[PDB]
Amino acid sequence: ALVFFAEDAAIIGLAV
Amino acid sequence: ALVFFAEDAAIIGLAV
Amino acid sequence: ALVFFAEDAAIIGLAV
Amino acid sequence: ALVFFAEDAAIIGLAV
Amino acid sequence: ALVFFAEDAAIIGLAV
Amino acid sequence: ALVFFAEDAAIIGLAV
Amino acid sequence: ALVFFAEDAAIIGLAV
Amino acid sequence: ALVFFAEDAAIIGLAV
Amino acid sequence: ALVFFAEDAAIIGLAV
Amino acid sequence: ALVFFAEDAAIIGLAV
Amino acid sequence: ALVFFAEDAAIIGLAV
Amino acid sequence: ALVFFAEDAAIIGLAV
Numbered sequence: 459a460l461v462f463f464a465e466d467a468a469i470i471g472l473a474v
Numbered sequence: 475a476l477v478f479f480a481e482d483a484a485i486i487g488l489a490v
Numbered sequence: 491a492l493v494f495f496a497e498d499a500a501i502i503g504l505a506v
Numbered sequence: 507a508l509v510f511f512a513e514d515a516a517i518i519g520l521a522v
Numbered sequence: 523a524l525v526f527f528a529e530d531a532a533i534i535g536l537a538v
Numbered sequence: 539a540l541v542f543f544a545e546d547a548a549i550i551g552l553a554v
Numbered sequence: 555a556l557v558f559f560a561e562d563a564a565i566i567g568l569a570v
Numbered sequence: 571a572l573v574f575f576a577e578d579a580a581i582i583g584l585a586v
Numbered sequence: 587a588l589v590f591f592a593e594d595a596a597i598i599g600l601a602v
Numbered sequence: 603a604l605v606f607f608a609e610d611a612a613i614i615g616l617a618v
Numbered sequence: 619a620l621v622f623f624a625e626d627a628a629i630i631g632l633a634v
Numbered sequence: 635a636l637v638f639f640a641e642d643a644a645i646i647g648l649a650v
Contacts (some may be wrong), residue, residue, distance in 0.1 A: 461501070461543035463509035465521065469477070469487025471501025473545065476536075477527035479557035481569065485493070485503025489529065493591035495573035497585065504572075505593065509533070511541035513553065517605070517615025519533025524568075525559035525613070535613025537561065541629070549573070549583025551629025557597070565637070565647025567597025575589035577601065581621070581631025584588075589645070599645025605623035607637035609649065617625065620648075621639035633641065
């Protein structure tokens, strides 16, 4: 899987 | 904008 | 306290 | 949006 | 000085 | 190129 | 609280 | 799961 | 060894 | 190559 | 020792 | 200047 970040502001890590 | 982290514990990134 | 990350995927920091 | 890095070497963050 | 990030998107570190 | 992480768990950086 | 870094050089995290 | 790093030196992320 | 952070606030890395 | 950061303040990653 | 990253692409931490 | 980390274990950032 790839890992990086996502912003909604809050920013979290995301694993896909 | 500035970016850094916020703690509530959970810690997230924050963009202001 | 220790600080590191937790995955549920979303990944956040955690402080214990 | 997704956040990660870009290399040109200089490396910066990028938000898409 | 404080250190954190700045977004213009490109994201860099900033020292103030 | 883009830079981010890959998980196999071991997690490394990856440059594409 | 906010979290980011402080430089004196040594650089540490700081929680405010 | 928890995420943090492991050193053998090479240092990688580890997910447990 | 494991690597992660410790908070006393100042935050440093720690290797165990 | 080695990777780390460079400060000019703006801070970027650098790959050598 | 110094700590930073090394790229071969895979990127890992390195301690010297 | 270059920025990276130093380990003594405690790990801090260092700016040279």
